[PDB]
Symmetry: C3
Subunit: 146 residues, 3 copies
Amino acid sequence: PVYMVYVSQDRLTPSAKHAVAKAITDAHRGLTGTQHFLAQVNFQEQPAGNVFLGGVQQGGDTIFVHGLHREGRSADLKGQLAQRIVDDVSVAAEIDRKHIWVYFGEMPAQQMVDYGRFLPQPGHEGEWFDNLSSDERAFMETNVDV
Amino acid sequence: PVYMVYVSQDRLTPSAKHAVAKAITDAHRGLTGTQHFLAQVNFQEQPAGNVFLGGVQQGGDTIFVHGLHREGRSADLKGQLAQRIVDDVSVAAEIDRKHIWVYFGEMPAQQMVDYGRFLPQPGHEGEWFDNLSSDERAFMETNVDV
Amino acid sequence: PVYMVYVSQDRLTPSAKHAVAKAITDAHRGLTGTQHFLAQVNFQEQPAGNVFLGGVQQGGDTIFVHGLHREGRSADLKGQLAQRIVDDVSVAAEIDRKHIWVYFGEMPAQQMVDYGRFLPQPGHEGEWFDNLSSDERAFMETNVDVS
């Protein structure tokens, strides 16, 4: 996946960013079976005060997670995954769940490219990976936080 | 909704950001009935010169509004809403409409979370809000301008 | 289109940003026929270390292209266009294709506004361009780099 994570500048320490990235990655792998290394978490920082809720300028606590997924999973699974992101990002970032917004968008795998390659359909990641070139597999394997 | 608003650094003062956020929020509230506090406007600033049109580097005037919505509204209404965003942001930002781009993306409400809670179907925002806890209601209430 | 291009701060010089924007623009016009000036490339820079892959903090090389398109094109065409972006951004940015991610999202043209106007359906950009104003056409034609 690509998870775009919109946070205020300096709200998350580097270690908190790492914990939030791990929380999202583990949740995605845990519920979908996709390999760790396909989960991209891309932090987008902006100065505090760039978020407005109902026209009211916010402090730095809002977190918006925009997850970009392949089509093909059930509404039930996507609900479980969104809830798990809310719960686990809240713990990892020490931010109340009321600050956390999570939207999932989906596209056909045929118009999605990770690491320069088109993605397979959900659940087919194992044989897709095994058929990648040796150097591609090796590069991908470096991106696993156990 | 979440309205991602891509603008050049320094092109909007704090009051202009507030005015643009209110223009978008009031448009969405007025045309959809959704509660004031559910409209997030999230300003994403980048240095001027990071926008290219037809390969030509731009100054700092372009505004791209990426609105992320629940599925369920009519094409008629979404068109009214996009037009009203163009008209009212042009006034609020003192920018000519030729500089304004507005795209709406839609997702099933079942994979959309505001304030840590899954959204209802559009017209059902009152009863959704009333089944919410007292503390959750109170926190949302604080996010209503004026 | 709008192509949101997520890169690390200082990985692309002003010259490389221009070259990447032209590569993306030329790919889109070449395969879709849409005029040059409707291709927006919007660079989003963040500090290196803000990207994680599999939980591992990355350096500054990842490039994510999020393309926002009208509905209406074939899966074949979208696949050719995504591959061409990978290939041509790899050349323009001097970056291995393994670093390049490209996702296309699509919406009805009826909820998409470029230059303050609603877009036509794919393939009908000529008639759409012909039917508004002289000032608008002039402004769009300033946004054409062919070199």
